[PDB]
């Protein structure tokens, strides 16, 4: 659904068509003007950062594994005559429709008997999904993956690509897959009895030399070398695929460009009348196009074990019954062609729709992981109460759409209760300790991180014990639309730390809430604060991120009693464009204000600019008003004359309109 | 007789034994003597038996 | 209907006898007995019993 | 809630017999007993006590 994913984008964000991606890492964000203030009994110290960049790093790598599951049939496409008043295939009108058609008379009785089983095999989501992946593999084919590269680095702990993804050879995305071609046979119209467990599709005119090569590779096993997101492992959809094309199927060309895959999709959707099938495939790919680079070192627990992708079995019986598909189809919603029409016009817009969906999910799974099991709406039972339909199993797209509904605070409506795609809530529901590997840089690591060893020499491979999952992404596109006090993503905020002159700089935060806001605002001001817990004896640093520049309470890496000693004569100025706290006395009052917002994207430590035309909000009415218009100007070549007009020179001629 | 779709591997064994002679050893009430109903039974199933 | 055209005249003649052969009571009776034989199959009968 | 509609007659027949005997109370009973054996697993029973 293009419509619901479009509304997630911010108001200030004005996207263009083309986006020239030339790397496997993008820092999307915005530039804002922060007017910071520090008030005290001595006086006020004002600062101003005119261009403050708040970013979330997003990569094109992520371990996924496809499995073939059984899903509901999508009945949108078949002629409206055979359907009854309630909206199910009234068998008896099917036998009537087949009888009054251009079918062979000896096949009518035997084909009608099979109809009861074969007409309820309508799900082309798996085919469209694979064909969409082939489009983006050939478009962004020049992106590279190095084996000994930095997945994450925060100064203390480092995590390499070798650690998370073993059995991984370095190669380009184009050179990753070597897809073998499945057989594309021609359906004989005079076949005695239809062959079930072999799908048959429709086609307009002649199957081109390149269309054979695309359909051949789409219905085949994906066995990748490099762990890419749009080239993950998928099982063999089918062995053989029939195509009811009276004009013969040309043999396989071997080569094809990304423009030829768009040609193949547009013919397949139009012939089969499968637009709702495409809408399902569009939302599936939106989840599993890009995966987020973790915000903290201990936020890598989400991507340790491979999340399963639920691909519904390829099943289509249109080739055997050409009569039942015509120009008057049955559809539930009137805006059922909107998702395809959006993709054909603006293919590269999927990148923005993808980051919008994963940012919405991973933000909400952040503040869902911090609720006790003894509650009404908890970790296990947040999907059941929200869903008001009848899906087969609460997995895939249902779990991701219900998290988006919680974030935006609106009602998401789909025409069919389809349960296909990636399932994210895997590591959460387990409710056990996860052992993430790490290579150390400094020697004073295991004070900060909950490490397995207490003394570790530099360059050693250690393990961190993560119990509660910290947030993987900070809200950026969904900044101050549905604000919570955990993230504290306000435009205006203030904190009041109360100290007396008798205290020699040392302040104890009994409250946990205002400790989080103090440590966060001090980092905007470019000050390196290092607090020490009095009960346990561990240490926390506000500088625990190089992207967002905020301090969340989950950076403590421990749930206990709150007694944080902060010594305010060991505060060090780290960044540029900073206010100085030289020597405070009395009550401190910190405050900031974010005024304006400008969309910015970075890649390879350089600005990535959006190019091409101005993207519009395509509606169903905007095309069918031109159908209402029809260009009703009678196609008659009316040539109008020009009267020559003489003036002073007479050498040169001058023509007038009348 | 008529049938919906394909006659399963077990449905053949049940219909085969139902249309046969009951020759019991012990005098049970639900296993009394019955003659052979029929020798052959046709089934109009386009999907093979 | 969806019948073979050469069979219509010969099948219609037989209809007078064959359409009045409708009694499946004997088949259902035997199939019901097979259900209860396999369900309560472990019951025993002794020869020299009271 | 399926595409393969050949298995519906078979599925219904088995489901009708099994749904009228569903009970997981005995499994949870033993799982609860295993929880408290591990937790309070340092209690001594002496045979020649009062």
From Swiss-Prot, chain A:
Gene3D superfamilies assigned to the protein according to its UniProt record, in alphabetical order: Major capsid protein (3.90.1840.10)
One GO-annotated biological process of the protein: viral translational frameshifting
SUPFAM superfamilies according to UniProt: L-A virus major coat protein
Domain of life: Viruses
One GO cellular component term: viral capsid
Places the protein is found: Virion
One MF annotation (Gene Ontology) recorded for this entry: RNA binding
Name recorded for this polypeptide: Major capsid protein
Lineage: Viruses, Riboviria, Orthornavirae, Duplornaviricota, Chrymotiviricetes
